[PDB]
Amino acid sequence: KACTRECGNLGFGICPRSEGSPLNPICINCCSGYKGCNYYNSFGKFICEGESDPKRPNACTFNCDPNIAYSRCGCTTCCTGYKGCYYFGKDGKFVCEGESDEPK
Amino acid sequence: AQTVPYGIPLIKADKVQAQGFKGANVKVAVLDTGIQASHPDLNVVGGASFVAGEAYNTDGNGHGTHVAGTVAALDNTTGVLGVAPSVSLYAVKVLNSSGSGSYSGIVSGIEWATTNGMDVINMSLGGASGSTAMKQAVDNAYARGVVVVAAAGNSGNSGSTNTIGYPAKYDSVIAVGAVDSNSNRASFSSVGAELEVMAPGAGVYSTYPTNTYATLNGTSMASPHVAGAAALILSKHPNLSASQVRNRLSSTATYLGSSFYYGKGLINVEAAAQ
Amino acid sequence: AQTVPYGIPLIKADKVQAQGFKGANVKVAVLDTGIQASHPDLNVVGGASFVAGEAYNTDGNGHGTHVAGTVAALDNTTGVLGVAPSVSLYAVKVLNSSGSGSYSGIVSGIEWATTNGMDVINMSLGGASGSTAMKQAVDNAYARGVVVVAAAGNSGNSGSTNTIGYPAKYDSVIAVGAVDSNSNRASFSSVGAELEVMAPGAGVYSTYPTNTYATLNGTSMASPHVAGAAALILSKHPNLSASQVRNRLSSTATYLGSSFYYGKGLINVEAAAQ
Ligand SMILES: [Ca+2]
Ligand SMILES: [Ca+2]
């Protein structure tokens, strides 16, 4: 895969990447969580699936949910970005999803 | 029997309260999941719901009550103590008992606040994208003289990645990051150029639905310290403009390091209301 | 009237044109997203597409048209000017509407240009990975006498990290970095042993699809300046080897700092063409 070598003007990127562990909990709630991702407590007990999706945003309380410990799921351009990430431009309006694979 | 959450002394709100300024006659709109108006330590004098089926003066979730407590927990001999104890508290419900809402719902709350004279608007909520309607709603509210405060978000950092959420990111809004009782940035505090000021957000104690109390985490807890600080200042100088109040908070803040991660620093209401 | 982007005077392309050398009769192939031949300021006299169901005479992306305009915008009375206006421009489409393309497609385009006796190849494109097939392609092109020019990349710097992409990273291809209107390296310009020379890569005004213009940023904009300089040098000394042209451009570059971030420096086609 080759991309046009122009420098893009995206605002930022969101990459729903699963993370955290019992002894090292992430901060999030079911609302702000990502669809396709599942969230568990310190004991590995299921709690909920992410309720939002990159495209089309919605409002969530900005507090960490004590019940959740972990989850399981600038020149960068849409072609240059990574699939599994959603890029937005200024005034964060959705633009595209990455097309490249993460380096190995 | 009243407890003073570390946050109050930390931002020096206690010093300002002793001078006699407690946010009297200053209206603060808490846009959230509602407030448990019947909590003995809270005094909700109004508001409105934009959530089908739920009244404004109830809170099935609990987050909106905790947020309010941090702002205006009454100063008596019970529970906790707010940053601006005499403030006029308004419950504008824009998130259902599950803590979820639509930008559409939020815009209605923002306009209600503006229209009805709120002096301060607190939004311990957000989305990762942001819309045109929301921006015009906050750009407008601020333009009408309203101090608009919002939680910066709990996405932590990631290299040089901007993780500030909306509406906190719009510059008509003050994006608030979070620190702990040691004045240290919480690891979950979002970062990025728009981060404006820090406030206590880790282990914040306050009112919680069903006349009780609880300890919560998140920039969601930091935002109401700033909104409350704004009210204190307005309590002392009613003539300041929404812009002037915003500048005192950020220009008199205690330096914590690089602006990207801490913005201007920890708010100091003693220095700001001076 | 005609506008001259800063890139032309910066690399002194004007000086050489005033000598009466404009790349006349030098065939240059722009392996990109195609070119909008119908654009008044351009004149595509051939090419080939390797993009299913799409003509090489049109450009759905815009990138190729822009790159092409820096290489050969006609020295008329309207629009912009190219580094070598009188060059025989060929659009070799190897990238789709979304600026993407498979290596094999690019390999096909490289071979084409080689088989059609192209003099210069401009690849304002790149991939993070190498490929025996691609290396062989540009290697035969160079061996056949083709001056191969590619964009180095936009990974910026980081310690001693080598962020030069492929094919630029190949030693048969001139890796081009970028600088601004002040000969200052653009922060996004990639670095490493392979960096060969620098060219204007920021705020490059050039032709844009459907008879207009735009200002883009990247090593994409810098590569064409170099491929164009290759053309001018060749129009003056018709029989120099691809190697000799390559060496004279890097050999007369004005020093700007460590070769790690500047290669030999900013190209000076006037000095190169002596
Ligand atoms: Ca109390
Ligand atoms: Ca022209």
XYZ file of C-alpha atoms and ligand atoms in Angstrom:
654
model
C 0.000 0.000 0.000
C 1.393 3.370 -1.099
C -0.078 6.780 -0.323
C 0.175 10.286 -1.754
C 3.068 11.876 0.149
C 1.223 15.129 0.880
C 0.883 16.234 4.512
C -2.692 16.043 5.749
C -4.616 18.505 7.888
C -6.631 16.277 10.201
C -7.596 17.448 13.671
C -7.166 14.271 15.698
C -7.679 10.539 15.792
C -9.624 8.095 17.944
C -8.558 4.429 17.908
C -10.817 2.091 19.915
C -8.004 -0.017 21.351
C -8.817 -2.429 24.191
C -6.798 -1.937 27.384
C -6.396 -2.072 31.140
C -6.136 -4.858 33.717
C -7.585 -5.633 37.193
C -4.699 -4.017 39.026
C -4.422 -1.225 36.434
C -7.985 -0.018 35.618
C -8.884 2.330 32.749
C -11.237 5.262 33.252
C -14.489 5.102 31.286
C -18.220 4.459 31.421
C -20.603 2.363 29.294
C -21.872 5.481 27.544
C -18.496 6.823 26.354
C -17.358 3.274 25.690
C -16.953 2.088 22.120
C -19.340 -0.233 20.298
C -17.737 -3.546 19.435
C -15.806 -3.308 22.691
C -16.706 -5.019 25.948
C -15.904 -3.778 29.437
C -15.237 -5.909 32.516
C -14.678 -5.343 36.259
C -11.637 -6.178 38.424
C -12.906 -9.768 38.585
C -13.355 -10.309 34.859
C -17.124 -10.034 35.089
C -18.878 -8.553 32.048
C -20.483 -5.150 32.610
C -21.506 -3.757 29.189
C -20.582 -3.111 25.550
C -19.508 0.336 24.374
C -22.558 2.450 23.663
C -21.123 5.000 21.257
C -19.489 4.919 17.859
C -16.860 7.210 16.265
C -19.092 8.607 13.512
C -22.143 10.268 15.128
C -21.175 11.374 18.678
C -23.305 11.764 21.789
C -23.075 13.152 25.308
C -21.869 11.147 28.293
C -21.102 12.037 31.915
C -17.343 12.494 32.263
C -16.789 10.310 35.295
C -14.870 7.061 35.624
C -17.164 4.090 36.315
C -15.721 2.342 39.403
C -17.257 -0.859 38.089
C -15.001 -1.031 35.030
C -11.342 -2.057 35.148
C -10.473 -2.981 31.576
C -11.766 -3.338 28.031
C -11.563 -5.761 25.112
C -12.359 -4.850 21.483
C -0.269 16.630 11.475
C 0.638 14.958 8.169
C -1.397 11.830 8.725
C -3.961 11.247 5.958
C -6.839 8.818 5.474
C -4.584 6.653 3.390
C -1.672 7.075 5.806
C -3.766 6.576 8.931
C -4.404 3.189 10.546
C -7.571 1.125 10.161
C -9.145 0.864 13.580
C -8.906 4.609 13.986
C -11.307 7.382 13.092
C -9.912 10.695 11.985
C -11.595 14.065 12.353
C -10.544 17.494 11.127
C -10.871 20.799 12.921
C -14.189 21.284 14.739
C -13.930 17.539 15.054
C -16.291 16.499 12.278
C -15.770 12.906 11.139
C -13.662 12.495 8.045
C -12.545 8.921 7.466
C -11.181 5.711 8.923
C -7.541 4.750 8.490
C -6.549 2.482 5.604
C -3.082 1.297 6.657
C -2.163 -1.546 9.037
C -0.169 -0.875 12.221
C 3.583 -1.585 11.921
C 4.848 -4.964 13.151
C -20.817 16.921 61.382
C -20.035 18.758 58.156
C -17.082 17.559 56.081
C -14.893 19.783 53.924
C -13.758 17.923 50.762
C -10.037 18.432 50.161
C -10.938 20.286 46.966
C -12.308 23.342 48.732
C -9.126 24.089 50.643
C -6.986 23.062 47.672
C -8.344 25.747 45.324
C -8.392 28.138 48.327
C -12.164 28.505 48.165
C -12.269 28.388 51.968
C -10.109 31.536 52.198
C -12.474 33.371 49.841
C -15.556 32.145 51.750
C -14.074 33.546 54.968
C -13.765 36.971 53.363
C -17.519 36.639 53.103
C -18.070 35.774 49.431
C -20.047 32.606 48.844
C -21.678 33.056 45.470
C -24.861 34.709 46.712
C -27.080 36.054 43.932
C -25.032 34.194 41.343
C -26.979 31.678 39.227
C -25.297 28.417 38.320
C -26.760 25.933 35.861
C -25.660 22.347 36.309
C -26.370 20.632 32.985
C -26.367 16.952 33.913
C -28.500 13.927 34.841
C -30.547 16.149 37.129
C -30.122 16.781 40.860
C -31.776 15.104 43.847
C -33.534 18.302 44.933
C -34.716 16.569 48.111
C -31.131 16.063 49.377
C -30.878 17.842 52.764
C -27.494 19.320 51.800
C -28.616 20.804 48.453
C -30.981 23.600 47.499
C -32.241 23.452 43.915
C -34.299 26.557 43.178
C -35.156 25.694 39.601
C -34.212 24.384 36.204
C -35.786 22.202 33.524
C -35.616 18.788 31.887
C -34.930 18.086 28.268
C -35.179 14.340 28.818
C -38.533 12.778 27.933
C -40.014 11.197 31.055
C -37.770 12.619 33.778
C -38.407 15.708 35.894
C -35.498 18.138 36.374
C -35.437 17.931 40.168
C -34.705 14.198 40.390
C -31.531 12.259 39.616
C -31.785 8.545 38.895
C -28.131 8.390 38.005
C -26.340 10.223 40.793
C -23.604 11.948 38.784
C -25.525 15.197 38.460
C -26.072 15.352 42.232
C -22.411 14.759 43.052
C -21.427 17.423 40.521
C -23.892 19.878 42.031
C -22.694 19.101 45.567
C -19.167 20.043 44.626
C -20.599 23.328 43.482
C -23.230 24.289 45.985
C -23.365 21.763 48.822
C -25.036 23.867 51.546
C -22.997 25.210 54.444
C -24.654 23.712 57.528
C -23.695 21.033 60.048
C -24.330 18.103 57.741
C -22.759 16.286 54.823
C -20.202 18.235 52.795
C -19.573 21.831 51.705
C -19.709 23.395 48.249
C -17.267 25.775 46.563
C -20.004 28.432 46.421
C -22.501 27.512 49.218
C -24.870 30.407 48.613
C -25.063 30.101 44.837
C -28.506 29.731 43.244
C -28.495 26.150 42.019
C -30.292 25.183 38.828
C -30.940 21.629 37.626
C -31.020 21.416 33.836
C -31.392 17.708 33.015
C -29.836 16.882 29.620
C -28.709 13.308 30.295
C -31.062 10.457 31.303
C -30.691 8.340 34.473
C -28.059 6.342 32.572
C -25.871 9.385 32.082
C -26.488 9.474 28.351
C -27.773 12.326 26.203
C -27.878 13.686 22.645
C -26.050 16.822 21.526
C -29.535 17.984 20.588
C -30.657 17.639 24.206
C -27.604 19.474 25.477
C -28.085 22.421 23.115
C -31.577 22.880 24.544
C -30.165 23.043 28.056
C -27.461 25.506 27.006
C -30.056 27.810 25.431
C -32.415 27.467 28.413
C -29.571 28.571 30.674
C -28.619 31.501 28.468
C -32.243 32.593 28.009
C -33.018 32.352 31.721
C -30.065 34.329 33.018
C -27.651 31.717 34.327
C -24.373 33.358 35.318
C -22.460 30.087 35.078
C -22.966 26.877 33.145
C -21.299 23.669 34.182
C -21.057 20.673 31.867
C -19.301 17.664 33.368
C -20.109 15.875 30.114
C -19.067 15.577 26.527
C -18.628 13.794 23.253
C -15.537 13.022 21.209
C -16.636 14.753 17.991
C -18.632 17.925 18.359
C -21.258 19.525 16.129
C -22.140 22.875 14.571
C -25.269 23.265 16.688
C -23.414 22.749 19.934
C -20.714 25.263 19.012
C -23.218 27.991 18.182
C -25.045 27.185 21.414
C -21.898 27.685 23.563
C -20.443 30.457 21.421
C -23.724 32.230 21.938
C -24.098 31.570 25.677
C -20.593 32.935 26.264
C -21.331 35.891 23.997
C -24.347 36.707 26.173
C -22.055 36.915 29.206
C -22.282 33.368 30.534
C -19.182 31.674 31.938
C -19.167 28.254 30.258
C -17.259 25.502 32.078
C -16.831 21.873 30.959
C -14.911 18.729 31.860
C -11.902 18.320 29.545
C -12.410 14.556 29.274
C -10.844 11.404 30.701
C -8.852 10.143 27.693
C -5.462 10.652 29.292
C -2.677 11.396 26.878
C -1.074 9.642 23.961
C 2.131 11.109 22.616
C 1.176 14.448 21.039
C -2.484 13.469 20.680
C -5.180 16.003 21.450
C -7.859 14.214 23.472
C -9.915 17.151 24.734
C -13.598 16.505 24.175
C -16.491 18.716 23.115
C -17.886 21.136 24.170
C -14.775 21.718 26.335
C -12.545 22.082 23.263
C -14.457 25.021 21.726
C -12.768 28.177 22.915
C -15.937 29.803 24.129
C -15.733 27.122 26.844
C -13.222 26.564 29.657
C -11.773 23.048 29.434
C -10.946 21.748 32.936
C -8.407 18.982 33.574
C -8.063 17.049 36.857
C -5.536 16.774 39.677
C -5.430 14.829 42.962
C -5.103 15.945 46.595
C -1.364 16.237 45.929
C -2.003 18.688 43.096
C -0.837 16.002 40.702
C -2.509 15.540 37.330
C -4.745 12.470 37.266
C -3.538 9.920 34.734
C -6.957 9.997 33.054
C -7.004 13.803 32.515
C -7.265 14.636 28.809
C -4.588 16.781 27.141
C -4.198 19.101 24.170
C -3.782 22.812 23.380
C -7.326 23.731 24.522
C -6.791 22.463 28.088
C -7.233 25.643 30.144
C -7.123 24.977 33.893
C -6.792 22.097 36.333
C -8.923 21.343 39.403
C -9.382 18.487 41.863
C -10.867 15.488 40.054
C -9.450 12.415 41.782
C -11.282 11.095 44.814
C -13.718 13.968 45.148
C -16.231 13.537 47.969
C -19.761 15.028 47.936
C -23.535 14.667 47.799
C -24.934 11.529 46.112
C -28.620 10.590 45.502
C -30.768 9.201 48.287
C -29.542 11.786 50.821
C -26.080 10.235 51.035
C -22.520 10.923 49.806
C -19.805 9.291 47.711
C -16.282 9.561 46.301
C -16.057 9.810 42.484
C -13.302 10.306 39.888
C -13.104 12.097 36.557
C -12.643 15.555 35.037
C -16.373 15.458 35.590
C -15.516 16.287 39.228
C -12.956 18.928 38.345
C -15.271 21.090 36.226
C -17.684 21.982 39.050
C -14.786 23.364 41.166
C -14.108 25.895 38.374
C -17.798 26.722 37.838
C -18.049 27.203 41.581
C -14.916 29.309 41.588
C -16.434 31.472 38.864
C -19.488 32.011 41.039
C -17.306 33.035 44.008
C -15.626 35.696 41.924
C -18.977 36.918 40.648
C -20.086 36.965 44.293
C -17.340 39.500 45.036
C -17.472 41.466 41.753
C -20.929 41.253 40.102
C -19.806 43.667 37.410
C -17.050 41.521 35.912
C -17.744 40.158 32.437
C -17.890 36.429 31.625
C -14.593 37.060 29.811
C -12.954 38.848 32.757
C -13.931 36.084 35.177
C -12.527 33.496 32.808
C -9.231 35.375 32.594
C -8.761 35.747 36.369
C -9.177 32.011 36.824
C -6.565 31.214 34.187
C -4.136 34.122 34.717
C -3.833 33.636 38.490
C -3.563 29.838 38.390
C -0.759 27.900 40.032
C 1.795 26.582 37.532
C 1.966 22.770 37.249
C 4.084 22.390 34.123
C 3.754 22.350 30.299
C 0.388 23.803 29.180
C -0.305 20.823 26.945
C -0.736 18.630 30.015
C -1.751 21.123 32.703
C -2.956 24.160 30.827
C -2.337 27.253 32.924
C -2.340 25.176 36.127
C -4.356 24.579 39.305
C -6.994 27.272 39.835
C -6.490 29.513 42.851
C -9.690 31.306 43.701
C -8.018 33.379 46.433
C -5.687 34.944 43.859
C -8.462 35.114 41.252
C -11.158 36.839 43.339
C -8.569 39.217 44.705
C -1.562 37.531 -14.932
C 0.848 34.685 -14.242
C 1.931 34.087 -10.640
C 5.301 32.555 -9.748
C 5.261 30.313 -6.654
C 8.229 30.966 -4.354
C 9.574 27.533 -5.186
C 10.701 28.631 -8.658
C 13.007 31.451 -7.547
C 14.090 29.630 -4.377
C 15.701 26.814 -6.417
C 16.703 29.409 -9.016
C 14.664 27.722 -11.752
C 13.901 31.191 -13.145
C 17.623 31.885 -13.666
C 17.950 28.778 -15.849
C 14.748 29.538 -17.746
C 16.140 33.019 -18.488
C 19.159 31.236 -19.959
C 16.545 29.843 -22.299
C 16.495 26.328 -20.850
C 13.041 25.128 -19.920
C 13.238 21.346 -20.154
C 12.287 21.440 -23.834
C 11.999 17.939 -25.237
C 12.613 16.122 -21.948
C 9.965 13.528 -21.169
C 8.859 13.577 -17.517
C 6.430 11.045 -16.057
C 4.333 11.930 -12.997
C 3.356 8.609 -11.434
C 0.506 9.884 -9.267
C -3.304 10.144 -9.139
C -3.353 11.291 -12.775
C -3.462 14.815 -14.202
C -6.364 16.979 -15.398
C -5.049 17.590 -18.965
C -8.022 19.852 -19.592
C -6.495 22.346 -17.142
C -5.395 25.395 -19.172
C -2.023 25.763 -17.380
C -1.014 22.168 -18.128
C -0.404 20.177 -21.285
C -0.345 16.391 -20.901
C 0.810 14.742 -24.137
C 0.456 11.132 -23.015
C 0.501 8.621 -20.223
C -1.032 5.428 -18.949
C -3.415 4.363 -16.217
C -3.067 1.307 -14.014
C -6.225 2.161 -12.107
C -9.175 0.003 -13.214
C -11.811 1.906 -15.182
C -10.124 5.306 -15.101
C -8.336 7.399 -17.713
C -4.874 8.833 -17.168
C -6.089 12.107 -18.711
C -8.267 12.984 -15.707
C -7.593 13.372 -11.989
C -10.234 12.607 -9.380
C -7.955 13.364 -6.407
C -6.104 16.582 -7.227
C -2.694 15.604 -5.874
C -1.246 14.543 -9.225
C -2.456 17.714 -10.942
C -0.788 19.797 -8.226
C 2.500 17.894 -8.364
C 2.416 18.074 -12.162
C 1.925 21.848 -12.100
C 5.064 22.325 -10.068
C 6.865 20.185 -12.579
C 5.436 21.839 -15.710
C 2.879 24.652 -15.404
C 2.939 26.404 -18.799
C 4.800 29.732 -18.940
C 1.896 31.609 -20.488
C -0.040 34.646 -19.254
C -2.316 33.116 -16.591
C -2.123 30.964 -13.465
C 1.181 29.661 -12.152
C 4.557 28.576 -13.503
C 6.302 25.211 -13.346
C 9.997 24.554 -12.732
C 10.312 23.313 -16.324
C 7.276 24.604 -18.309
C 8.350 23.403 -21.758
C 8.738 19.796 -20.624
C 6.808 16.993 -22.350
C 4.448 15.985 -19.525
C 3.131 12.422 -19.130
C 0.493 11.369 -16.614
C 1.091 7.826 -15.379
C -1.866 7.061 -13.089
C -0.901 4.580 -10.351
C -2.943 5.937 -7.456
C -6.734 5.952 -7.159
C -9.179 8.749 -6.338
C -8.328 8.453 -2.628
C -4.586 8.839 -3.147
C -3.901 5.141 -2.593
C -2.423 2.375 -4.715
C -0.892 -1.092 -4.668
C 2.836 -1.483 -5.129
C 2.309 -3.691 -8.193
C 0.338 -0.893 -9.786
C 3.192 1.503 -9.138
C 5.582 -1.163 -10.479
C 3.479 -1.263 -13.666
C 3.654 2.505 -13.970
C 7.403 2.518 -13.393
C 7.924 -0.076 -16.138
C 5.684 1.832 -18.515
C 7.682 5.062 -18.159
C 10.872 3.059 -18.598
C 9.588 1.289 -21.692
C 8.347 4.562 -23.146
C 11.758 6.170 -22.787
C 10.838 8.595 -20.022
C 13.723 10.794 -18.886
C 12.472 11.548 -15.388
C 10.049 9.844 -12.996
C 8.390 11.717 -10.137
C 6.921 9.683 -7.291
C 5.328 11.962 -4.706
C 4.155 8.820 -2.911
C 5.409 6.278 -0.387
C 4.810 3.218 1.757
C 6.275 2.148 5.089
C 7.404 -1.231 3.757
C 9.924 -2.265 1.132
C 9.348 -4.634 -1.797
C 11.724 -6.642 -3.941
C 9.466 -5.917 -6.920
C 9.496 -2.140 -6.432
C 13.217 -1.972 -5.797
C 13.849 -3.909 -9.001
C 11.572 -1.525 -10.920
C 13.215 1.769 -9.919
C 16.608 -0.017 -10.150
C 16.042 -0.884 -13.837
C 14.643 2.575 -14.502
C 17.829 4.175 -13.184
C 19.913 1.550 -14.986
C 18.010 2.342 -18.190
C 18.939 5.987 -17.718
C 15.877 7.354 -15.939
C 16.330 9.988 -13.215
C 14.061 8.614 -10.454
C 12.731 11.079 -7.897
C 10.580 10.325 -4.866
C 9.166 12.137 -1.830
C 11.130 11.184 1.286
C 8.143 11.146 3.627
C 6.387 13.201 6.279
C 7.268 11.315 9.460
C 9.162 14.268 10.935
C 12.076 13.484 13.253
C 12.651 11.734 16.577
C 16.120 11.232 18.005
C 18.146 9.170 15.510
C 15.120 7.433 13.980
C 15.298 6.926 10.207
C 11.871 7.833 8.925
C 12.527 7.689 5.183
C 9.877 5.731 3.286
C 9.998 3.553 0.153
C 10.790 3.998 -2.704
C 12.663 7.196 -1.689
C 14.767 5.057 0.625
C 16.101 3.131 -2.365
C 19.557 4.168 -3.497
C 18.403 4.325 -7.128
C 15.898 7.017 -6.219
C 16.611 10.580 -5.069
C 14.919 11.004 -1.680
C 13.619 14.588 -1.474
C 13.020 16.498 1.750
C 11.163 19.770 2.287
C 11.843 23.352 3.401
C 9.678 26.470 3.621
C 9.855 29.868 1.903
C 12.826 30.569 4.168
C 15.029 27.568 3.311
C 14.111 26.184 6.729
C 13.463 22.456 6.885
C 9.760 21.674 7.369
C 9.247 19.911 10.687
C 7.376 17.097 8.887
C 10.208 16.403 6.437
C 11.557 12.884 6.974
C 15.199 12.231 7.918
C 17.978 9.666 7.683
C 21.060 8.532 5.763
C 18.998 8.221 2.602
C 17.855 11.852 2.526
C 19.547 13.270 -0.570
C 18.403 16.843 -1.186
C 15.866 19.431 -0.026
C 13.265 21.331 -2.062
C 10.307 23.653 -1.444
C 7.703 21.538 0.346
C 5.534 23.914 2.365
C 2.872 26.299 1.074
C 3.455 25.342 -2.542
C 0.964 27.092 -4.796
C 0.188 25.012 -7.864
C -2.493 23.873 -10.282
C -5.534 22.116 -8.828
C -8.349 20.080 -10.548
C -11.005 21.751 -12.598
C -8.975 24.715 -13.761
C -8.021 26.202 -10.399
C -5.187 26.326 -7.851
C -4.507 25.411 -4.237
C -1.780 25.447 -1.629
C -0.677 22.068 -0.321
C 2.038 20.883 2.054
C 4.343 17.846 1.985
C 7.376 16.193 0.436
C 4.883 15.568 -2.377
C 5.275 19.224 -3.280
C 9.074 19.062 -2.941
C 9.723 16.016 -5.135
C 8.402 17.642 -8.343
C 10.734 20.642 -7.870
C 13.629 18.202 -8.065
C 12.274 16.166 -10.985
C 11.745 19.492 -12.747
C 15.297 20.608 -12.055
C 16.396 17.273 -13.529
C 14.498 18.211 -16.708
C 16.030 21.709 -17.025
C 19.532 20.338 -16.554
C 18.828 17.768 -19.238
C 17.392 20.301 -21.682
C 20.703 22.155 -21.419
C 23.010 19.116 -21.536
C 20.913 16.573 -23.528
C 23.396 13.715 -23.233
C 24.307 13.625 -19.511
C 23.678 10.285 -17.785
C 20.886 9.927 -15.232
C 23.737 9.537 -12.744
C 25.510 12.742 -13.813
C 22.286 14.761 -13.537
C 21.615 13.266 -10.121
C 25.137 13.983 -8.952
C 25.173 17.575 -10.219
C 21.952 18.412 -8.357
C 23.220 16.953 -5.081
C 26.736 18.166 -5.874
C 25.776 21.843 -6.127
C 23.176 21.963 -3.391
C 23.566 24.773 -0.937
C 24.479 23.376 2.509
C 21.869 23.773 5.243
C 22.999 21.524 8.049
C 23.575 17.894 8.911
C 23.015 15.606 5.955
C 20.740 13.716 8.338
C 18.113 16.441 8.138
C 19.151 18.213 4.965
C 20.901 15.732 2.732
C 23.259 17.867 0.662
C 20.852 20.781 1.066
C 18.448 22.896 -0.996
C 18.800 22.279 -4.750
C 20.168 25.101 -6.893
C 19.438 24.207 -10.527
C 21.383 27.286 -11.694
C 24.524 25.934 -10.066
C 23.536 22.400 -11.120
C 23.092 23.440 -14.758
C 26.416 25.347 -15.111
Ca -23.150 20.625 54.552
Ca 0.680 30.013 -16.159
